[PDB]
Design a protein around this ligand. Structure first.
Ligand SMILES: Nc1nc2c(ncn2[C@@H]2O[C@H](COP(=O)(O)OP(=O)(O)O)[C@@H](O)[C@H]2O)c(=O)[nH]1
Ligand SMILES: [Mg+2]
Length: 237
C-alpha cells in the first residue's frame, strides 16, 4: 500500500489535498471556524485503483518551541507511516509562498533528515487562482528564488490541485499526480524514505515483538534525539 505524508504549513491545503486524493471527506478542513484536529491522522483508501495510506499532519512544520507536543506529533507521524513514506507530499498554496513556507521546507528536513527530498513531490493547491495560465509557465516565471530552489531539489516533481474542483476537474488532476508518482516510483525503484527512527517505529508496532521494552515516553524521547541529529547534520554545511 502506497504511503504518503502530507507536509506543509497550516492553511496551505494539506487536509483538503488528502481528502481529494482519497475521494472522501476524512480530514478536518474547516473554512473559518475553530478546528479540532491537533494531531496526525491516518486514512486508508483507494486512489486510481491503487490502495493508498495517507498521513495528515498538524502544525509540525512551523516556528514553534521544543515541547512534548511537538515530539508526540512527530512521533505519531513516523508511527503511522512506518516503515516510511514513499512520497512526501509538500503542499504549497499557489500564489501564496511566503516566509512560513520557507520555514516549512527547513523543518521538513529537520523532521525527516537526509534523503527525504528524493521522495518529495510539490503539490500546488488553489490551481484555480492560476487563471488560464499553465503551471509549467508559472513555476518558470515566479519571482520567488526560494521556490525555484525547491523545484530544482525536487527534480521538477510538482503538481496542482483544485480541491474545490468538479468531478471532471478532480479526476484530471489525480491522473496528473499519478504520473509524477509513477515517475518517482520508478526513479526510486519502489523505495520508501527511512531512517533509524522510522525503523525504531516499525519494530515497535509489528506484532511478535513480545518485550514491551520501549515506552511512549521512551519513544518520544528517541524522537527528540533523532531530530537533534538531523539538526546537527544540517548545521554542518
Ligand atoms: N479554493 C480552494 N480552497 C482550498 C484548496 N485547498 C484547500 N482549500 C481551503 O483552504 C482552507 C485550509 O485548507 P486545509 O486543508 O485545512 O489546510 P491545512 O491547514 O494544511 O490542513 C480550507 O478551508 C480549504 O477549504 C484549493 O485547492 N482551492
Ligand atoms: Mg488540516
Amino acid at each position: 500500500a502506497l504511503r504518503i505524508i502530507l507536509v506543509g504549513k497550516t492553511g496551505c491545503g494539506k487536509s483538503a489535498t488528502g481528502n481529494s486524493i482519497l475521494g472522501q471527506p476524512v480530514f478536518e478542513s474547516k473554512l473559518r471556524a475553530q478546528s479540532v484536529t491537533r494531531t496526525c491522522q491516518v486514512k486508508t483508501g483507494t486512489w486510481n485503483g491503487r490502495k493508498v495510506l495517507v498521513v495528515d499532519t498538524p502544525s509540525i512544520f512551523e516556528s514553534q518551541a521544543d515541547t512534548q507536543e511537538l515530539y508526540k506529533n512527530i512521533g505519531d507521524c513516523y508511527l503511522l507511516s512506518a516503515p516510511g513514506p514513499h512520497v512526501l507530499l509538500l503542499v504549497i498554496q499557489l500564489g501564496r509562498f511566503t516566509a512560513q513556507d520557507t520555514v516549512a521546507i527547513r523543518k521538513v528536513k529537520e523532521v525527516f533528515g537526509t534523503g527525504a527530498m528524493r521522495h518529495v513531490v510539490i503539490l500546488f493547491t488553489h490551481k484555480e487562482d492560476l487563471g488560464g495560465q499553465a503551471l509549467d509557465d508559472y513555476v518558470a516565471n515566479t519571482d520567488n528564488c526560494s521556490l525555484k530552489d525547491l523545484v530544482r531539489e525536487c527534480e521538477r516533481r510538482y503538481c496542482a490541485f483544485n480541491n474545490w474542483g468538479s468531478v471532471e476537474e478532480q479526476r484530471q488532476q489525480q491522473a496528473e499526480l499519478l504520473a509524477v508518482i509513477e515517475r518517482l516510483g520508478r526513479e526510486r525503484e519502489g523505495s520508501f524514505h527511512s531512517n533509524d527512527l522510522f525503523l525504531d517505529a516499525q519494530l515497535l508496532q509489528r506484532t511478535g515483538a513480545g518485550a514491551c521494552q520501549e515506552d511512549y515516553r521512551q519513544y518520544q524521547a528517541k524522537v527528540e534525539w533523532q531530530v537533534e541529529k538531523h539538526k546537527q547534520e544540517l548545521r554542518e554545511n
